[PDB]
Write a protein that binds this ligand. Structure first.
Ligand SMILES: [Mg+2]
Length: 102
RNA sequence: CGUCAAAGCACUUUGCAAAAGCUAACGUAUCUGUUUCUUGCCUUUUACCAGAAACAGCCGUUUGUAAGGUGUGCUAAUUUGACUGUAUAGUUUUUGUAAUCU
């Protein structure tokens, strides 16, 4: 769209918001939502998260289900913990990498 | 304008209660009477004359409250009150200079 001017009112701001998804990088969230693809999360405390993604916010606030979360740290020993459902604040997201289900 | 709360609401009839507290129009209006004094005209009384003080009456006004009436509603309408009431990932607070060890 020809409105990245960043000086907008509410309706065109919402249009730009939806375009920020429909073609922006956050577009990866939609096809991950609709294709039910595996997505891995890198948190800012060196945490590894992999799970289904169901909904996301523009802030990258994400609701996850069936999360497998692993962390490593004596001698370096990797450990894992599976939790049913997650609400992760997009503040702490560093990286997302998708594992295609197919 | 917004949110929350409780009250049906608008208009109206009647009863009860109150109306200066920090000197100030309950009424931006305005009458009558009684008692006690001082006066005026006076043959005596009422009826009077015009000033004061202390008291009352009448014509009115405002507010609170209680029970009703009319017209509209409760499948919503209006009124009253309270409120620390609004955006915003791009340096001054809320979308992380973090983890790492000590
Ligand atoms: Mg005689």
């Amino acid at each position: 769209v020809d409105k990245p001017r960043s000086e907008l009112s509410e309706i065109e701001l919402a249009r730009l918001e939806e375009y920020e998804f429909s073609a922006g990088p956050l577009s990866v969230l939609q096809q991950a939502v609709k294709n039910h693809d595996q997505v891995l999360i890198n948190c800012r405390n060196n945490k590894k998260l992999l799970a289904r993604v169901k909904a996301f916010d523009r802030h990258s606030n994400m609701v996850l289900e069936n999360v497998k979360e692993m962390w490593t740290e004596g001698k370096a020993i990797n450990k894992d913990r599976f939790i049913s459902k997650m609400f992760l604040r997009g503040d702490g997201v560093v990286l997302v990498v998708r594992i295609p289900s197919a």
